[PDB]
């Protein structure tokens, strides 16, 4: 029928794609934790930090097959894009039946007394079966775990106290009148079953919310197009828009900017440190004006 109808929407498509990752250092310090000769006890789990490095996760797939590989907030195969902004890595040895306890929100003697992940946890828990290296025919007693504590642990706390714990009512000193040593050894043996065999667990802990990053990006960068509708990837922030020269007085402190409604409207180029504004590519509704089928097939 004669009239004006709103039928669709125009979008300006990008013509080029860009990636602007920071200068690559070619440092990938991941074999130091995965390929270490000794791992820490779970009661005193080890912690390292990764900064000013570039990661390539194929190396750990080259390192070994794994018993378990569970990521929260991120999936495998997506770690070759920007994957970290602040990097820690925890390392410990645990029992097979307790491997399921290294996960957000779990309870048990390790989740409660030795090592706990926050409920709001982003990262990957990688478990390798280590019987060949950690078990001894007499039992490997270098690994200790805490069995007694007065209260539950909080996320990422490390309780390394060895003070005697009492389960009874009469305050005792020393060991054996209801006073017990808080740690117990586990003698790992080659003859134990899968759930009792030793496992080496590495937990990669990071946050993807912060604007700057000093880690990740095996991807090659491109040249910086400006004043043209393009796709872009700036330190893991992806989108479509027109990039322009900025006159915003960013502090050396600030990395990203946002508009009145808390959506990104500016970035600091990771290689040039120039401030660029982001204007989304033009779009809008499209309406068709027709005299109607019974008059003419011309439209505006």
């Amino acid at each position: 029928e004669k009239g004006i109808y709103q039928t669709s929407n125009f979008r300006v498509q990008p013509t080029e794609s860009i990636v602007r990752f920071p200068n690559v250092t070619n440092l990938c310090p991941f074999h130091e934790v995965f390929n270490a000769t000794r791992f820490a006890s779970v009661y005193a789990w080890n912690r390292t930090r990764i900064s000013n490095c570039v990661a390539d996760y194929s190396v750990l797939y080259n390192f070994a097959p794994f018993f378990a590989f569970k990521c929260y907030g991120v999936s495998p195969t997506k770690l070759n894009d920007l994957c970290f902004t602040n990097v820690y890595a925890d390392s410990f040895v645990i029992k097979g039946n307790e491997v399921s306890q290294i996960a957000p929100g779990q309870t048990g003697n390790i989740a409660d007394y030795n090592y706990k992940l926050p409920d709001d946890f982003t990262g990957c828990v990688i478990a390798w079966n280590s019987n060949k290296l950690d078990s001894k025919h007499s039992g490997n007693y270098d690994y200790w775990y805490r069995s007694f504590r007065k209260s539950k642990l909080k996320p990422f706390e490390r309780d390394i106290s060895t003070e005697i714990y009492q389960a009874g009512n009469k305050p005792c000193k020393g060991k054996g009148p209801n006073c017990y040593f808080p740690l117990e050894s586990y003698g790992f043996r080659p003859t134990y079953g899968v759930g009792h065999q030793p496992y080496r667990v590495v937990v990669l802990s990071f946050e993807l919310l912060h604007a700057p990053a000093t880690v990740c990006g095996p991807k090659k960068s491109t040249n910086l197009v400006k004043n043209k509708c393009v796709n872009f990837n700036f330190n893991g922030l992806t989108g479509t828009g027109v990039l322009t020269k900025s006159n915003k007085k960013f502090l050396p402190f600030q990395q990203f900017g946002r508009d009145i409604v808390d959506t990104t409207d500016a970035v600091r180029d990771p290689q040039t440190l120039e401030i660029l504004d982001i204007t989304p590519c033009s779009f809008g509704g499209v309406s068709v004006i027709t005299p109607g089928t019974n008059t003419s097939n011309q439209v505006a």
Partner: protein
């Protein structure tokens, strides 16, 4: 003598009321300043 041929009272009535939506070809504003917020500034699909 005035553009739009409004009466003095109409001129005051229009000057007193502030219009936040300001419908026009919003692309004219372009950028070069902090976003006005006029309330999606088109970009979030609200026009």
């Amino acid at each position: 003598s005035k553009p739009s041929k409004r009466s003095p009272i109409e001129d005051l009535l229009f000057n007193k009321v502030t219009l936040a939506d300001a419908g026009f070809i919003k692309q004219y504003g372009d950028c070069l300043g902090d976003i006005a917020a006029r309330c999606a500034q088109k970009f979030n699909g609200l026009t």
